[PDB]
Design a binder for this molecule. Structure first.
Ligand code: HEM
Ligand SMILES: Cc1cc(Br)ccc1O
Length: 137
């Protein structure tokens, strides 16, 4: 289930962080509006870029903490307020988060691995709700 998936993802975290983020940017190319230094790059070029690998892993490190602190795929209010109040997220709306979670769920459903895609879909939904409650437009 969900707790085991958190373990799986952490066991190859820099590969999953990069592959899921690329799945997101390829499925929703207009999202590069928020990531102007990743324009005009292939997947392999982004994987060679220091900022890409370090950004994606730090993002994914925190996402897994938020997932792990959740109960029944509902994140803590303290984690949602962190994500809302982060200067880095100044320009974001919940739609940005929804799209990331659609991309993650479709990644999991396309893998041959027994990921609990329904729990991740729920988590993404619940996180979007928590971000709204914590002040995200
Ligand atoms: C659960 C979801 C997310 C978590 C846990 C999270 C976490 C983080 C963290 C830890 C950083 C700092 C990274 C660093 O400085 O190395 C960060 C920066 C940033 N995040 Fe998020 N983030 C989330 C979702 C998103 C989404 C959906 C967007 C936009 C679609 C976004 C846009 C950014 C941007 C633009 C930055 C700074 C510049 C850069 O990306 O390199 N984040 N986020
Ligand atoms: C939105 C997002 C998701 C992942 Br996974 C890695 C980096 C990033 O900015």
């Amino acid at each position: 289930g969900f707790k085991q998936d958190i373990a799986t993802l952490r066991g190859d975290l820099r590969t999953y962080a990069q592959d899921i983020f690329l799945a997101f940017l390829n499925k929703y190319p207009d999202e590069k509006r928020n990531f102007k230094n990743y324009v005009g790059k292939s997947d392999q070029e982004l994987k060679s870029m220091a900022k890409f690998g370090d950004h994606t892993e730090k993002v994914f490190n925190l996402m897994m903490e938020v997932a792990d602190r959740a109960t029944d795929c509902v994140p803590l209010a303290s984690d949602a307020s962190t994500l809302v109040q982060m200067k880095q997220h100044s320009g974001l709306t919940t739609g940005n988060f929804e799209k990331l979670f659609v991309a993650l769920v479709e990644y999991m459903r396309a893998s041959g691995q027994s990921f609990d895609s329904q729990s991740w879909d729920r988590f993404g939904k619940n996180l979007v709700s928590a971000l709204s409650s914590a002040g995200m437009k």
